[PDB]
């Protein structure tokens, strides 16, 4: 399960936030896009797969994933498509920083920073970002 991601959309202030969660770590990647289109979905997936070893993405089965451009990007990147706890939290963190920035895009990326750096537990814990890299590094044997 080092290659398993879950992708969802959240609609806010009339734009769309594409959120990808690495299911094993809780690590998040997100973008704000003007609209939930095939072109934007494909691009997002391609960016993700170039940065992390993406095997399988679980989606909501919306029309943006049925696109010939998404199928092509998935074939090219070797991504297989199939088919909240962390997504609900991301919405909460976006509210807590919302006032610190003019644009929603900024607030979103500040929330991704906060989420991925935040140590869970006491001294001896890990962040989501530590967890993804430890998991992947461990798998490289």
Ligand X SMILES: Cn1nc(-c2cccs2)cc1N
Ligand Y SMILES: OC[C@H]1O[C@@](CO)(O[C@H]2O[C@H](CO)[C@@H](O)[C@H](O)[C@H]2O)[C@@H](O)[C@@H]1O
Note the residues at the interface with ligand Y (CB under 6 A): 31-33, 40, 43-44, 47, 105
> Which C-beta is closer to ligand Y: that of 34 or that of 122?
34
Task: Tell which positions 54-113 bind ligand X, by CB under 6 A.
Answer: none
- Strands of 27-33's sheet, edge to edge? 27-33, 15-22, 4-12, 56-58, 80-82
- Give alpha helix (H) positions in the chain: 38-51, 68-77, 85-97, 104-117, 128-139
Residues 6 or more apart in contact with residue 117 via CB below 8 angstroms? 127, 129
Query: Residue 93 and residue 107: Cα distance in Å, rounded?
Result: 9
- Stretches 37-45, 58-66, 87-95, 123-131: which one binds ligand X (CB under 6 A)? 123-131
**Which residues share a beta bridge with 110?**
none
**In this chain, which of 80, 92, 103, 117 binds ligand X, going by CB under 6 A?**
117
In the bound state with ligand X, the residue whose beta carbon lies nearer, of 99 and 123, is: 123
**Residue that the structure tokens 């092509």 belong to:** 72
Q: Is residue 52 within the footprint of ligand X (CB under 6 A)?
A: yes
- The binder of ligand X chosen from 35, 53, 66, 95 (CB under 6 A): 53
Residue 129 interacting with ligand X (CB under 6 A): yes
Output the residue with the shortest Cβ distance to ligand Y: 31
User: Rounded to an integer, what distance in angstroms lies between the CA atom of residue 130 and that of residue 72?
Assistant: 32
Give the residues lining the site for ligand X (CB under 6 A): 51-53, 116-117, 127, 129-130, 132-133, 136-140
């Amino acid at each position: 399960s080092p290659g398993i991601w879950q992708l969802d959309c959240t609609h806010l202030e009339g734009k769309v936030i594409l959120v990808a969660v690495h299911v094993a770590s809780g690590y998040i990647e997100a973008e704000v896009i003007p609209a939930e289109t095939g072109q934007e979905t494909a691009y997002f997936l391609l960016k993700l797969a170039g940065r992390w070893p993406v095997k399988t993405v679980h989606t909501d089965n919306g029309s943006n994933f049925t696109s010939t451009t998404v199928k092509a990007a998935c074939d090219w990147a070797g991504i297989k498509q199939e088919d909240e706890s962390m997504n609900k939290e991301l919405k909460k963190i976006i509210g807590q920083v919302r006032d610190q920035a003019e644009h929603l895009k900024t607030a979103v990326q500040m929330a991704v920073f906060i989420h991925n750096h935040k140590r869970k537990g006491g001294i001896g814990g890990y962040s989501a970002g530590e967890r993804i890299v430890d998991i992947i590094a461990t798998d490289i044997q």
